[PDB]
Amino acid sequence: CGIWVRTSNGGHFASPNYPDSYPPNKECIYILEAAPRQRIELTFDERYYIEPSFECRFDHLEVRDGSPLIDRYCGMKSPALIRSTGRFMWIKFSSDEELEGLGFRAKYSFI
């Protein structure tokens, strides 16, 4: 399930079956790994522009720098852009048993 994107200035990152709804009962961990002095650009294109729908503690998306957990988002919002200086971005996507929805898309790039 993990989509490793090492040593690419650009590529794409999105939920499983991304145009479709995400499969349930996933637990997939993702990495953005960069060289020293190589800065990472992380970008969320929303597939669904609204203030987040299900704001709660299941089906969260964690974001990890280095691990002080920066944040967890859920429902149907985009986090704004976050600028990487730890250069090792760790992305965890979790899925529940019974809440299945539009999923998400991302864009990573090295700067």
Binding site: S53, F54, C56, F58, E98, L99
Partner: protein, 473 residues
Amino acid sequence: THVLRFGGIFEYVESGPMGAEELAFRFAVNTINRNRTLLPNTTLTYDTQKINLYDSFEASKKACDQLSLGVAAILGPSHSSSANAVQSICNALGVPHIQTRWKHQVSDNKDSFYVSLYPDFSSLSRAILDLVQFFKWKTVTVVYDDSTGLIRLQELIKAPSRYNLRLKIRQLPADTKDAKPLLKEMKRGKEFHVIFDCSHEMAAGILKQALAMGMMTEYYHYIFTTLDLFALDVEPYRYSGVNMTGFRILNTENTQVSSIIEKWSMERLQAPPKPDSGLLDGFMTTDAALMYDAVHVVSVAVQQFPQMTVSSLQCNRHKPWRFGTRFMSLIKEAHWEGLTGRITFNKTNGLRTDFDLDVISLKEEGLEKIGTWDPASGLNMTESQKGKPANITDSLSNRSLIVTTILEEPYVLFKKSDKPLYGNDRFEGYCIDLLRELSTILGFTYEIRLVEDGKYGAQDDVNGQWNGMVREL
């Protein structure tokens, strides 16, 4: 044939589709017209004005209008906002007012020219309490949609201080689909007795949700305070093995009731329904039934007040109607069999506190009666178990015994065989020898089942709940 007119007010589609209340009212006037047993010497016409929803001034002007032509009384619009306008109009100009939809009772409104055939919320809520008390639930949960549901259940809300309970309160959000995350937390909440105060349309819009998140299993039991519990799209869900429970003053026992129901059903899908919404097409709704009854009680009074006159009054000639005194009193004092059962007015709160209620529940087939309720005694709800069916006194081994067992090396084994054999013959061992011997001694019949979790069993501290053999026992 004394001509009379009844003011008609309908917050409606403002478009082509015609509303159910207008329909039942005209159905009512026709019913008067055909059977002269009521009013042999009298026939009443009517003026039916139509307005916008939640829009006072427009209603008030229309109120002055249906004053202009003169009636005996108005029939209230089915929403409280302009309903207050209607009422502060009626008692202001003395014409009796009849309301169908529940309004927010304003504690000190000294109006006196109004009644409401609607089952007053207090009595309903008291029955709710009696019901839940009988079912011995503790972690009940209410979900409403807007404000006034809480009021409908205030008597419920105040229960805990007298009755050992708990209940959180949860809200269906602004739009209907928004209730899915609510079901999410309730799943997290694990609240297995959730009463609902909600419009049956929303009940439908949420049952798809509940089955969709699979919440409907046999443990969960919901009770729906609404009164159009009849027209639910019941059929698929009754095999989810859920209990529902609800009320219906809407009698169906009278065959006259039925006959009128099919006459309606002919005139009803006559109006284009919404089968895509998941409602059973062809069944008249509780409100429309109420407002059918209301004309009839008006009549059953008025036939004894031929001194009825219709003063063509104006809103600015502030002197009230000439004959609102005794006529309104008559309605207060009258009694009748409408389409809901015994009809009466409290004559104290100037409303209704008395009626007859059949509690109904989702059986294996659908809506089937599970009792009766009335103000005086309260709940006489009975039970489908009576007459001791298929029961023998001092019967020996009338039912067989469900014997559990564990698989162990020298204790219980499989009779080593090649062809596929089953039943209580796969299992063979020392414990089986003991079981057979003691069953021959005590003369019983037994079936064999392995424990599924497959262990002796021990107390799991995190839930204080047994496991395996002990738990299945």
